[PDB]
Ligand binder design. Structure first.
Ligand code: HEC
Ligand code: HEC
Ligand code: HEC
Ligand code: HEC
Ligand code: MOO
Length: 107
């Protein structure tokens, strides 16, 4: 399938983020849209039964906060864990890519 246009809003929370597929088009679709039950899975992350727990303290697979903000990952990358690798030791990239505010995720 085809990546959607840029400027997509992730707005399940009071701290929404703009996701641009163009900034991520060197990654395989399934790197984020991981298959579920052996079928292609393009459903929104916080779909009921999926990543639908919004408690930030929740560490279960259902935590919406975890799958985005976890600094470490193994099987599927988080937003954070990949960006921490890309920013690395770099000062400005850490700011743009990994910061909690004044970043490109959370301006
Ligand atoms: C981009 C890679 C991000 C960085 C860097 C940080 N966060 Fe984030 N955040 C991101 C997304 C995609 C979302 C969900 C957007 C939506 O509304 O659908 C969030 C949301 C949050 C929230 C609200 C969570 C909730 O209310 O359930 C918080 C409190 C939050 N983010 C905090 C946070 C902190 C503390 C960070 C620094 C360590 C940080 N974010 C970075 C994406 C990204
Ligand atoms: C990780 C960095 C991703 C890669 C690589 C690709 N996509 Fe994606 N996509 C990603 C996120 C965080 C979201 C928002 C989901 C949400 O819960 O809001 C999306 C969204 C889509 C959608 C849905 C668009 C809509 O109008 O709801 C589609 C159809 C989609 N993405 C397709 C897609 C394809 C085909 C990709 C490979 C070429 C691809 N994406 C890459 C994260 C990531
Ligand atoms: C419901 C059918 C889901 C949707 C839609 C999305 N995910 Fe998911 N996720 C789901 C399951 C059943 C699992 C179990 C483990 C597996 O690899 O199948 C996961 C796992 C993840 C993880 C790893 C979490 C962990 O505990 O280490 C991540 C980081 C993740 N998923 C991300 C993710 C994103 C970004 C999604 C939207 C684009 C998304 N998932 C959709 C169930 C479902
Ligand atoms: C690695 C596999 C990544 C994952 C998973 C996510 N992102 Fe990412 N992102 C990645 C790189 C290497 C870059 C720099 C490339 C560039 O074109 O600048 C980015 C960039 C962003 C940005 C900044 C630019 C922009 O599109 O506004 C944002 C806001 C961003 N990425 C958000 C984001 C979110 C919310 C993710 C989780 C769903 C996520 N990215 C995953 C690498 C990777
Ligand atoms: O944006 Mo919230 O009210 O911490 O789930």
């Amino acid at each position: 399938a085809e990546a959607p246009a840029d400027g997509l809003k992730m707005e399940n929370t009071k701290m929404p983020v703009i996701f641009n597929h163009s900034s991520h088009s060197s990654y395989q679709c399934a790197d984020c849209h991981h298959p579920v039950d052996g079928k292609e899975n393009l459903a929104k992350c916080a779909t009921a039964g999926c990543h639908d727990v919004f408690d930030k303290k929740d560490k279960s697979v259902h935590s919406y906060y975890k799958i985005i903000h976890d600094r470490k990952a193994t099987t599927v990358a988080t937003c954070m864990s990949c960006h921490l690798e890309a920013a690395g030791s770099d000062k400005d990239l850490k700011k743009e890519l990994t910061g909690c505010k004044k970043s490109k995720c959370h301006p």
